[PDB]
PDB file of C-alpha atoms in Angstrom:
ATOM      1  CA  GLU A 391      41.737  38.017 -65.718  1.00 21.68           C
ATOM      2  CA  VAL A 392      39.999  39.580 -68.661  1.00 18.71           C
ATOM      3  CA  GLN A 393      42.238  41.886 -70.650  1.00 21.53           C
ATOM      4  CA  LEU A 394      41.483  44.127 -73.826  1.00 23.77           C
ATOM      5  CA  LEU A 395      44.330  45.914 -75.808  1.00 21.77           C
ATOM      6  CA  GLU A 396      44.145  48.266 -78.726  1.00 26.37           C
ATOM      7  CA  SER A 397      46.551  48.992 -81.134  1.00 25.91           C
ATOM      8  CA  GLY A 398      47.108  50.726 -84.604  1.00 23.91           C
ATOM      9  CA  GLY A 399      46.554  54.444 -83.675  1.00 19.65           C
ATOM     10  CA  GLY A 400      49.025  57.049 -84.698  1.00 21.69           C
ATOM     11  CA  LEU A 401      49.087  60.449 -86.849  1.00 19.14           C
ATOM     12  CA  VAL A 402      47.195  60.448 -90.310  1.00 19.49           C
ATOM     13  CA  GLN A 403      46.526  63.136 -92.996  1.00 17.29           C
ATOM     14  CA  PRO A 404      42.896  64.054 -93.473  1.00 20.93           C
ATOM     15  CA  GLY A 405      41.315  61.790 -96.176  1.00 24.07           C
ATOM     16  CA  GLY A 406      43.673  58.768 -95.090  1.00 25.56           C
ATOM     17  CA  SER A 407      42.939  55.357 -93.618  1.00 21.91           C
ATOM     18  CA  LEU A 408      43.910  53.288 -90.474  1.00 21.40           C
ATOM     19  CA  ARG A 409      43.145  50.001 -89.049  1.00 23.28           C
ATOM     20  CA  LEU A 410      42.852  49.537 -85.434  1.00 29.30           C
ATOM     21  CA  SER A 411      42.713  46.236 -83.932  1.00 31.25           C
ATOM     22  CA  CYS A 412      41.982  44.887 -80.286  1.00 32.10           C
ATOM     23  CA  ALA A 413      43.104  41.388 -78.624  1.00 31.20           C
ATOM     24  CA  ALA A 414      41.231  39.893 -75.990  1.00 33.34           C
ATOM     25  CA  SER A 415      41.761  37.398 -73.592  1.00 34.74           C
ATOM     26  CA  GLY A 416      40.185  35.785 -70.389  1.00 35.29           C
ATOM     27  CA  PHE A 417      36.856  35.296 -71.886  1.00 35.76           C
ATOM     28  CA  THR A 418      35.148  33.296 -74.724  1.00 37.25           C
ATOM     29  CA  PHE A 419      35.502  35.988 -77.331  1.00 36.50           C
ATOM     30  CA  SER A 420      32.534  34.677 -79.420  1.00 34.66           C
ATOM     31  CA  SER A 421      30.061  34.712 -76.524  1.00 33.49           C
ATOM     32  CA  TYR A 422      30.185  38.691 -76.506  1.00 32.49           C
ATOM     33  CA  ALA A 423      29.279  41.716 -78.570  1.00 30.21           C
ATOM     34  CA  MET A 424      32.250  44.327 -78.698  1.00 26.92           C
ATOM     35  CA  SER A 425      31.864  47.874 -79.420  1.00 26.56           C
ATOM     36  CA  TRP A 426      34.398  50.640 -80.179  1.00 28.59           C
ATOM     37  CA  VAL A 427      33.871  54.015 -78.331  1.00 30.39           C
ATOM     38  CA  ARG A 428      36.143  57.178 -78.554  1.00 29.12           C
ATOM     39  CA  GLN A 429      36.912  60.280 -76.555  1.00 28.57           C
ATOM     40  CA  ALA A 430      38.243  63.438 -78.164  1.00 27.65           C
ATOM     41  CA  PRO A 431      40.990  65.072 -75.865  1.00 27.88           C
ATOM     42  CA  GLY A 432      39.164  66.839 -72.982  1.00 30.00           C
ATOM     43  CA  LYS A 433      35.596  65.651 -74.158  1.00 31.30           C
ATOM     44  CA  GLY A 434      33.062  62.959 -73.250  1.00 26.21           C
ATOM     45  CA  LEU A 435      32.717  59.530 -74.832  1.00 27.57           C
ATOM     46  CA  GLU A 436      31.217  59.035 -77.937  1.00 30.97           C
ATOM     47  CA  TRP A 437      29.912  55.093 -79.042  1.00 30.32           C
ATOM     48  CA  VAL A 438      31.332  54.455 -82.516  1.00 31.01           C
ATOM     49  CA  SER A 439      30.510  51.062 -83.635  1.00 31.79           C
ATOM     50  CA  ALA A 440      29.392  47.376 -82.169  1.00 29.65           C
ATOM     51  CA  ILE A 441      29.435  43.909 -83.463  1.00 27.03           C
ATOM     52  CA  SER A 442      27.530  40.843 -82.202  1.00 24.39           C
ATOM     53  CA  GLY A 443      29.138  37.663 -80.853  1.00 26.82           C
ATOM     54  CA  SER A 444      29.036  35.915 -84.149  1.00 28.66           C
ATOM     55  CA  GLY A 445      29.980  38.664 -86.457  1.00 28.50           C
ATOM     56  CA  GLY A 446      26.226  38.570 -88.165  1.00 30.26           C
ATOM     57  CA  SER A 447      25.150  42.115 -86.888  1.00 29.33           C
ATOM     58  CA  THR A 448      26.891  45.127 -86.747  1.00 28.57           C
ATOM     59  CA  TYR A 449      25.921  48.603 -85.836  1.00 29.19           C
ATOM     60  CA  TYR A 450      27.546  52.369 -86.521  1.00 27.61           C
ATOM     61  CA  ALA A 451      26.953  55.878 -85.290  1.00 28.76           C
ATOM     62  CA  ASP A 452      25.506  58.106 -87.770  1.00 32.43           C
ATOM     63  CA  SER A 453      28.592  59.994 -88.123  1.00 28.38           C
ATOM     64  CA  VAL A 454      30.690  57.163 -89.082  1.00 26.80           C
ATOM     65  CA  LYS A 455      28.284  55.425 -91.328  1.00 22.72           C
ATOM     66  CA  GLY A 456      29.686  54.708 -94.837  1.00 24.66           C
ATOM     67  CA  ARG A 457      33.179  55.331 -93.651  1.00 26.28           C
ATOM     68  CA  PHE A 458      34.112  52.917 -90.790  1.00 26.14           C
ATOM     69  CA  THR A 459      33.690  49.279 -90.918  1.00 29.09           C
ATOM     70  CA  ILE A 460      33.813  46.832 -87.903  1.00 29.11           C
ATOM     71  CA  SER A 461      34.880  43.175 -87.983  1.00 28.21           C
ATOM     72  CA  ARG A 462      35.955  40.336 -85.656  1.00 29.85           C
ATOM     73  CA  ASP A 463      38.072  37.007 -85.905  1.00 32.39           C
ATOM     74  CA  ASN A 464      36.902  34.860 -83.522  1.00 31.90           C
ATOM     75  CA  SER A 465      39.599  32.381 -83.821  1.00 32.96           C
ATOM     76  CA  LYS A 466      42.114  34.889 -82.846  1.00 33.50           C
ATOM     77  CA  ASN A 467      40.359  36.665 -80.021  1.00 32.97           C
ATOM     78  CA  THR A 468      40.729  39.811 -82.419  1.00 31.76           C
ATOM     79  CA  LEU A 469      38.536  42.894 -83.010  1.00 29.41           C
ATOM     80  CA  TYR A 470      39.106  45.367 -85.804  1.00 29.20           C
ATOM     81  CA  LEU A 471      37.907  48.841 -87.096  1.00 31.23           C
ATOM     82  CA  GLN A 472      38.878  49.744 -90.434  1.00 34.57           C
ATOM     83  CA  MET A 473      38.570  53.704 -90.551  1.00 37.34           C
ATOM     84  CA  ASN A 474      38.476  55.427 -94.273  1.00 37.34           C
ATOM     85  CA  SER A 475      37.849  58.893 -94.972  1.00 38.96           C
ATOM     86  CA  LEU A 476      39.284  60.493 -92.022  1.00 39.97           C
ATOM     87  CA  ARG A 477      38.551  63.771 -91.057  1.00 41.71           C
ATOM     88  CA  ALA A 478      39.864  65.956 -87.954  1.00 42.28           C
ATOM     89  CA  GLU A 479      36.592  65.448 -86.181  1.00 40.66           C
ATOM     90  CA  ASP A 480      37.600  61.664 -85.711  1.00 40.15           C
ATOM     91  CA  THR A 481      40.706  62.675 -83.825  1.00 37.90           C
ATOM     92  CA  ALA A 482      40.300  60.960 -80.559  1.00 39.74           C
ATOM     93  CA  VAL A 483      41.357  58.129 -78.084  1.00 38.52           C
ATOM     94  CA  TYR A 484      39.605  55.013 -79.370  1.00 37.14           C
ATOM     95  CA  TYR A 485      38.682  52.149 -76.616  1.00 33.45           C
ATOM     96  CA  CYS A 486      37.355  48.749 -77.699  1.00 31.22           C
ATOM     97  CA  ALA A 487      35.110  47.600 -75.071  1.00 31.57           C
ATOM     98  CA  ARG A 488      33.287  44.241 -74.287  1.00 31.10           C
ATOM     99  CA  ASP A 489      29.462  44.971 -74.422  1.00 30.77           C
ATOM    100  CA  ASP A 490      26.403  43.373 -73.107  1.00 28.57           C
ATOM    101  CA  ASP A 491      23.585  41.965 -75.538  1.00 27.47           C
ATOM    102  CA  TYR A 492      21.194  44.594 -76.803  1.00 32.39           C
ATOM    103  CA  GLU A 493      18.386  41.981 -77.071  1.00 34.80           C
ATOM    104  CA  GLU A 494      18.575  42.082 -72.966  1.00 37.24           C
ATOM    105  CA  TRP A 495      16.975  45.657 -73.219  1.00 38.09           C
ATOM    106  CA  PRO A 496      15.223  46.769 -71.095  1.00 38.13           C
ATOM    107  CA  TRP A 497      18.015  45.193 -68.569  1.00 39.45           C
ATOM    108  CA  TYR A 498      20.935  46.400 -70.847  1.00 36.86           C
ATOM    109  CA  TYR A 499      24.107  46.217 -68.167  1.00 36.31           C
ATOM    110  CA  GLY A 500      26.667  48.072 -70.289  1.00 34.12           C
ATOM    111  CA  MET A 501      30.299  47.724 -71.301  1.00 35.42           C
ATOM    112  CA  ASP A 502      31.760  45.669 -68.465  1.00 31.61           C
ATOM    113  CA  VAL A 503      35.741  45.349 -69.872  1.00 32.91           C
ATOM    114  CA  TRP A 504      37.511  48.448 -71.564  1.00 30.41           C
ATOM    115  CA  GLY A 505      40.990  48.612 -73.422  1.00 30.33           C
ATOM    116  CA  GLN A 506      43.688  51.033 -72.561  1.00 29.71           C
ATOM    117  CA  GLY A 507      42.728  53.210 -75.713  1.00 29.52           C
ATOM    118  CA  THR A 508      45.013  54.160 -78.706  1.00 30.11           C
ATOM    119  CA  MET A 509      45.267  57.643 -79.761  1.00 28.51           C
ATOM    120  CA  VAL A 510      44.420  58.478 -83.250  1.00 28.91           C
ATOM    121  CA  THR A 511      45.313  62.038 -84.466  1.00 26.93           C
ATOM    122  CA  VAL A 512      43.957  63.189 -87.878  1.00 25.68           C
ATOM    123  CA  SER A 513      45.827  66.457 -88.963  1.00 26.53           C
TER     124      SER A 513
ATOM    125  CA  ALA B 719      23.261  62.894 -75.749  1.00 27.41           C
ATOM    126  CA  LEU B 720      22.166  62.344 -72.449  1.00 25.50           C
ATOM    127  CA  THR B 721      21.926  65.312 -70.232  1.00 25.81           C
ATOM    128  CA  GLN B 722      23.973  65.514 -66.938  1.00 25.39           C
ATOM    129  CA  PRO B 723      25.284  68.154 -64.801  1.00 26.38           C
ATOM    130  CA  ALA B 724      28.657  69.581 -65.747  1.00 25.39           C
ATOM    131  CA  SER B 725      30.110  69.274 -62.115  1.00 24.17           C
ATOM    132  CA  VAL B 726      29.332  68.233 -58.371  1.00 26.96           C
ATOM    133  CA  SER B 727      31.157  68.372 -55.246  1.00 30.29           C
ATOM    134  CA  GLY B 728      31.083  67.584 -51.717  1.00 27.99           C
ATOM    135  CA  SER B 729      33.571  66.723 -48.675  1.00 28.75           C
ATOM    136  CA  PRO B 730      34.477  63.315 -47.313  1.00 28.46           C
ATOM    137  CA  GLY B 731      31.799  61.445 -45.732  1.00 29.29           C
ATOM    138  CA  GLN B 732      29.011  63.435 -47.845  1.00 24.48           C
ATOM    139  CA  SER B 733      26.467  62.102 -50.485  1.00 27.66           C
ATOM    140  CA  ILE B 734      26.347  63.105 -53.978  1.00 28.40           C
ATOM    141  CA  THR B 735      23.904  62.449 -56.458  1.00 29.06           C
ATOM    142  CA  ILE B 736      24.346  62.729 -60.233  1.00 27.46           C
ATOM    143  CA  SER B 737      21.190  62.993 -62.492  1.00 29.64           C
ATOM    144  CA  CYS B 738      21.140  61.663 -66.248  1.00 31.12           C
ATOM    145  CA  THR B 739      18.191  62.776 -68.394  1.00 31.08           C
ATOM    146  CA  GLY B 740      17.031  61.035 -71.678  1.00 31.76           C
ATOM    147  CA  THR B 741      14.078  60.542 -73.805  1.00 34.31           C
ATOM    148  CA  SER B 742      11.315  58.009 -73.778  1.00 34.24           C
ATOM    149  CA  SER B 743      13.301  56.047 -76.503  1.00 38.86           C
ATOM    150  CA  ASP B 744      16.196  55.383 -74.225  1.00 41.35           C
ATOM    151  CA  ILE B 745      16.026  55.998 -70.309  1.00 40.35           C
ATOM    152  CA  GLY B 746      12.297  55.953 -70.709  1.00 40.52           C
ATOM    153  CA  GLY B 747      12.544  52.468 -72.049  1.00 39.37           C
ATOM    154  CA  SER B 748      15.271  51.213 -69.572  1.00 42.01           C
ATOM    155  CA  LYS B 749      14.655  49.524 -66.175  1.00 42.19           C
ATOM    156  CA  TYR B 750      18.473  49.668 -65.378  1.00 41.32           C
ATOM    157  CA  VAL B 751      20.975  52.357 -66.285  1.00 40.15           C
ATOM    158  CA  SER B 752      24.491  51.684 -66.473  1.00 37.56           C
ATOM    159  CA  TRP B 753      27.115  54.205 -64.935  1.00 38.12           C
ATOM    160  CA  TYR B 754      30.904  54.462 -65.792  1.00 35.65           C
ATOM    161  CA  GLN B 755      33.659  56.007 -63.838  1.00 36.97           C
ATOM    162  CA  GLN B 756      36.734  57.380 -65.681  1.00 37.32           C
ATOM    163  CA  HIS B 757      39.783  58.791 -63.515  1.00 42.39           C
ATOM    164  CA  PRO B 758      42.385  61.395 -65.344  1.00 44.14           C
ATOM    165  CA  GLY B 759      44.079  59.491 -67.924  1.00 43.11           C
ATOM    166  CA  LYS B 760      42.527  56.395 -67.538  1.00 42.49           C
ATOM    167  CA  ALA B 761      39.622  54.383 -69.625  1.00 41.05           C
ATOM    168  CA  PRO B 762      36.542  54.132 -68.263  1.00 39.35           C
ATOM    169  CA  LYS B 763      35.210  51.675 -65.824  1.00 40.72           C
ATOM    170  CA  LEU B 764      31.810  50.099 -65.410  1.00 39.61           C
ATOM    171  CA  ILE B 765      30.552  50.759 -62.022  1.00 37.96           C
ATOM    172  CA  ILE B 766      29.216  47.668 -60.535  1.00 37.41           C
ATOM    173  CA  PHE B 767      26.678  47.857 -57.719  1.00 38.89           C
ATOM    174  CA  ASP B 768      26.510  45.447 -54.391  1.00 38.08           C
ATOM    175  CA  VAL B 769      22.978  43.984 -53.999  1.00 37.80           C
ATOM    176  CA  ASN B 770      23.692  43.180 -50.347  1.00 36.81           C
ATOM    177  CA  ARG B 771      22.685  45.936 -48.156  1.00 35.61           C
ATOM    178  CA  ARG B 772      24.730  46.688 -44.689  1.00 37.36           C
ATOM    179  CA  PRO B 773      23.329  45.242 -41.632  1.00 36.25           C
ATOM    180  CA  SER B 774      23.039  48.740 -39.875  1.00 35.50           C
ATOM    181  CA  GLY B 775      21.230  50.104 -42.989  1.00 34.29           C
ATOM    182  CA  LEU B 776      24.093  52.287 -43.976  1.00 35.68           C
ATOM    183  CA  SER B 777      23.817  53.337 -47.466  1.00 35.69           C
ATOM    184  CA  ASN B 778      25.910  51.545 -49.996  1.00 36.47           C
ATOM    185  CA  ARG B 779      28.667  53.891 -51.471  1.00 37.44           C
ATOM    186  CA  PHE B 780      27.643  53.487 -55.028  1.00 35.83           C
ATOM    187  CA  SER B 781      23.771  53.201 -55.855  1.00 38.11           C
ATOM    188  CA  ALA B 782      21.614  54.026 -58.704  1.00 38.69           C
ATOM    189  CA  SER B 783      18.040  54.228 -59.493  1.00 35.39           C
ATOM    190  CA  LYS B 784      15.732  55.316 -62.326  1.00 38.28           C
ATOM    191  CA  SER B 785      12.462  57.058 -63.148  1.00 39.53           C
ATOM    192  CA  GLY B 786      10.696  57.454 -66.340  1.00 38.71           C
ATOM    193  CA  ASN B 787      13.373  59.517 -68.685  1.00 38.69           C
ATOM    194  CA  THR B 788      15.575  60.216 -65.647  1.00 40.59           C
ATOM    195  CA  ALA B 789      18.416  58.217 -63.813  1.00 40.53           C
ATOM    196  CA  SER B 790      20.393  58.953 -60.716  1.00 39.01           C
ATOM    197  CA  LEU B 791      23.850  57.545 -59.602  1.00 38.27           C
ATOM    198  CA  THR B 792      24.355  58.237 -55.659  1.00 37.32           C
ATOM    199  CA  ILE B 793      27.618  58.009 -54.040  1.00 39.02           C
ATOM    200  CA  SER B 794      27.656  58.241 -50.106  1.00 39.11           C
ATOM    201  CA  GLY B 795      30.307  58.294 -47.792  1.00 39.84           C
ATOM    202  CA  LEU B 796      32.327  60.275 -50.075  1.00 40.48           C
ATOM    203  CA  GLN B 797      36.127  59.640 -50.652  1.00 43.65           C
ATOM    204  CA  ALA B 798      38.916  61.279 -52.138  1.00 46.73           C
ATOM    205  CA  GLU B 799      39.361  58.198 -54.653  1.00 48.64           C
ATOM    206  CA  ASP B 800      35.791  58.960 -56.116  1.00 49.10           C
ATOM    207  CA  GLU B 801      37.203  62.044 -57.654  1.00 49.56           C
ATOM    208  CA  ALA B 802      36.704  61.308 -61.516  1.00 49.29           C
ATOM    209  CA  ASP B 803      34.230  62.101 -64.292  1.00 48.82           C
ATOM    210  CA  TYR B 804      31.098  60.030 -64.525  1.00 51.35           C
ATOM    211  CA  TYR B 805      28.966  59.137 -67.371  1.00 54.90           C
ATOM    212  CA  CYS B 806      25.503  57.269 -67.722  1.00 50.08           C
ATOM    213  CA  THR B 807      24.652  55.331 -70.679  1.00 48.57           C
ATOM    214  CA  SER B 808      21.486  54.015 -72.422  1.00 49.81           C
ATOM    215  CA  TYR B 809      20.724  51.882 -75.236  1.00 48.46           C
ATOM    216  CA  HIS B 810      18.387  53.291 -77.990  1.00 47.90           C
ATOM    217  CA  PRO B 811      16.825  51.433 -80.887  1.00 47.06           C
ATOM    218  CA  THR B 812      18.453  53.680 -83.690  1.00 50.66           C
ATOM    219  CA  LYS B 813      21.275  55.237 -82.332  1.00 49.84           C
ATOM    220  CA  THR B 814      22.299  52.149 -80.641  1.00 49.03           C
ATOM    221  CA  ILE B 815      24.230  53.510 -77.584  1.00 46.28           C
ATOM    222  CA  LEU B 816      24.042  56.857 -76.006  1.00 46.00           C
ATOM    223  CA  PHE B 817      26.072  58.388 -73.206  1.00 44.13           C
ATOM    224  CA  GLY B 818      25.781  61.166 -71.147  1.00 46.67           C
ATOM    225  CA  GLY B 819      28.008  64.272 -71.470  1.00 48.16           C
ATOM    226  CA  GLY B 820      29.837  63.614 -68.182  1.00 47.08           C
ATOM    227  CA  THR B 821      29.908  65.165 -64.726  1.00 43.61           C
ATOM    228  CA  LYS B 822      33.224  66.047 -63.035  1.00 45.03           C
ATOM    229  CA  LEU B 823      32.971  65.176 -59.413  1.00 44.60           C
ATOM    230  CA  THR B 824      35.397  67.176 -57.072  1.00 46.20           C
ATOM    231  CA  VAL B 825      35.791  65.869 -53.526  1.00 44.73           C
ATOM    232  CA  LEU B 826      36.756  69.107 -51.251  1.00 47.26           C
ATOM    233  CA  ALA B 827      38.414  69.238 -48.126  1.00 46.61           C
TER     234      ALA B 827
ATOM    235  CA  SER C 230      37.915  26.073 -50.648  1.00 46.54           C
ATOM    236  CA  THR C 231      35.198  23.698 -52.203  1.00 47.96           C
ATOM    237  CA  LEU C 232      32.729  26.455 -51.428  1.00 49.73           C
ATOM    238  CA  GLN C 233      34.800  29.333 -53.242  1.00 51.95           C
ATOM    239  CA  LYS C 234      35.304  26.623 -56.357  1.00 50.88           C
ATOM    240  CA  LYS C 235      31.480  25.809 -56.460  1.00 50.28           C
ATOM    241  CA  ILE C 236      30.447  29.335 -56.405  1.00 51.65           C
ATOM    242  CA  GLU C 237      33.277  30.178 -59.262  1.00 52.90           C
ATOM    243  CA  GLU C 238      32.142  27.373 -61.371  1.00 52.27           C
ATOM    244  CA  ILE C 239      28.119  28.812 -61.290  1.00 52.72           C
ATOM    245  CA  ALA C 240      29.375  32.361 -61.517  1.00 47.73           C
ATOM    246  CA  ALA C 241      31.221  31.383 -64.845  1.00 49.00           C
ATOM    247  CA  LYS C 242      27.868  30.003 -66.429  1.00 48.56           C
ATOM    248  CA  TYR C 243      26.863  33.854 -66.209  1.00 46.72           C
ATOM    249  CA  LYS C 244      28.134  36.262 -69.054  1.00 47.56           C
ATOM    250  CA  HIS C 245      27.933  39.815 -67.615  1.00 48.51           C
ATOM    251  CA  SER C 246      30.101  40.982 -64.791  1.00 47.44           C
ATOM    252  CA  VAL C 247      27.076  42.763 -63.017  1.00 46.12           C
ATOM    253  CA  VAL C 248      25.181  39.047 -63.217  1.00 46.74           C
ATOM    254  CA  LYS C 249      28.373  37.289 -61.925  1.00 45.52           C
ATOM    255  CA  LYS C 250      28.661  40.050 -58.948  1.00 43.08           C
ATOM    256  CA  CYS C 251      24.807  39.037 -58.385  1.00 44.87           C
ATOM    257  CA  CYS C 252      26.116  35.345 -57.809  1.00 42.31           C
ATOM    258  CA  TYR C 253      28.924  36.378 -55.365  1.00 43.58           C
ATOM    259  CA  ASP C 254      26.494  38.641 -53.454  1.00 40.19           C
ATOM    260  CA  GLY C 255      24.003  35.647 -53.249  1.00 37.34           C
ATOM    261  CA  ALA C 256      26.680  33.445 -51.965  1.00 33.04           C
ATOM    262  CA  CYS C 257      27.655  35.578 -49.060  1.00 35.21           C
ATOM    263  CA  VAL C 258      26.476  34.452 -45.536  1.00 34.62           C
ATOM    264  CA  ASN C 259      23.316  35.948 -44.048  1.00 37.17           C
ATOM    265  CA  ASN C 260      21.704  33.960 -41.021  1.00 39.27           C
ATOM    266  CA  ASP C 261      18.802  36.623 -40.636  1.00 41.24           C
ATOM    267  CA  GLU C 262      17.127  35.908 -44.192  1.00 41.07           C
ATOM    268  CA  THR C 263      16.367  33.429 -46.481  1.00 41.54           C
ATOM    269  CA  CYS C 264      17.568  33.486 -50.147  1.00 39.57           C
ATOM    270  CA  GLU C 265      13.904  34.069 -50.940  1.00 37.13           C
ATOM    271  CA  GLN C 266      13.419  37.143 -48.494  1.00 40.00           C
ATOM    272  CA  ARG C 267      16.815  38.482 -49.899  1.00 40.96           C
ATOM    273  CA  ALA C 268      16.016  38.078 -53.582  1.00 40.59           C
ATOM    274  CA  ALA C 269      12.570  39.681 -53.150  1.00 39.74           C
ATOM    275  CA  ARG C 270      14.540  42.978 -52.525  1.00 43.07           C
ATOM    276  CA  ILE C 271      16.459  42.820 -55.669  1.00 40.12           C
ATOM    277  CA  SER C 272      16.124  45.624 -58.065  1.00 44.59           C
ATOM    278  CA  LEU C 273      18.495  44.753 -60.977  1.00 45.21           C
ATOM    279  CA  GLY C 274      16.321  42.316 -62.975  1.00 41.60           C
ATOM    280  CA  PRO C 275      15.529  38.883 -63.600  1.00 41.45           C
ATOM    281  CA  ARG C 276      19.270  38.087 -64.883  1.00 43.84           C
ATOM    282  CA  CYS C 277      20.581  39.174 -61.824  1.00 43.37           C
ATOM    283  CA  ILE C 278      18.025  37.627 -59.462  1.00 44.42           C
ATOM    284  CA  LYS C 279      18.584  34.114 -61.110  1.00 45.36           C
ATOM    285  CA  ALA C 280      22.185  34.296 -60.593  1.00 43.32           C
ATOM    286  CA  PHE C 281      21.968  35.444 -57.092  1.00 38.80           C
ATOM    287  CA  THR C 282      19.194  32.758 -56.077  1.00 37.71           C
ATOM    288  CA  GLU C 283      21.216  29.984 -57.559  1.00 38.57           C
ATOM    289  CA  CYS C 284      24.421  30.770 -55.776  1.00 37.89           C
ATOM    290  CA  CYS C 285      22.732  31.772 -52.754  1.00 37.96           C
ATOM    291  CA  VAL C 286      20.804  28.273 -52.364  1.00 40.89           C
ATOM    292  CA  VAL C 287      24.127  26.577 -53.374  1.00 39.84           C
ATOM    293  CA  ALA C 288      26.196  28.300 -50.847  1.00 41.96           C
ATOM    294  CA  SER C 289      23.801  27.503 -48.047  1.00 43.71           C
ATOM    295  CA  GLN C 290      23.204  23.857 -49.058  1.00 43.21           C
ATOM    296  CA  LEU C 291      27.219  23.449 -48.905  1.00 40.61           C
ATOM    297  CA  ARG C 292      27.357  25.203 -45.499  1.00 36.52           C
ATOM    298  CA  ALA C 293      24.826  23.116 -44.068  1.00 33.74           C
ATOM    299  CA  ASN C 294      27.165  20.175 -44.704  1.00 32.70           C
TER     300      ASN C 294
END
């Protein structure tokens, strides 16, 4: 029923730019916060960015603050990540995921739907 | 990051417990800690826990608990398909979302 | 199955998969214990208890018919 699918991944030179997108089906997109999470080859998961259902709140990891911009088009069930000033450290598989409401902490239940991942190589 | 052991292992039918330790600001402030399972070449998947108990008192295959700054995932009645990487996560008021470094679970003969 | 339809309708009101699962578990048949007895034992928080309870009570009412 619920599906997420990323696209926009590819090879890019350091200092370059790239735009990822994530399309969603099976749920009311605007009811859910969405996140981007990345995983470098053979490494662990690192949270990158999140955006509230309405788009009114955004959150970024320290390592991408000022370079990455998250957004969503609720009329098209689409999430975006604009990545600028890319460096080799940014090389990873990028996943979009459907997140829980951070306002529900201390009962935060995690990311319940994940895409397939798109590979970004900065070299 | 949250701290997990690098790897754990056991044989079919055994029970394994993976720990996850954070700070007072993340796991410490959480009443529930979420876990993910990642098979090789696949996206992570949220581990969904059963709320119903089995009639004999047999442990559920996947269960979790937490106390203070530490959380634990227990996998009992271990099966070959449980071979995977496991990640805990937590909300954090300034870092937003933290992950553990991951634990590789091997199912032996 | 109208039972399955009604339970899916209720679960559709809850957002997170964890909470939806709490509803489906609630609807599961148990003839040794009440919804209240089963719900007292839930460790996954108020959101889960709410869904579990609603689905448990509705499933019980339906099956009584």
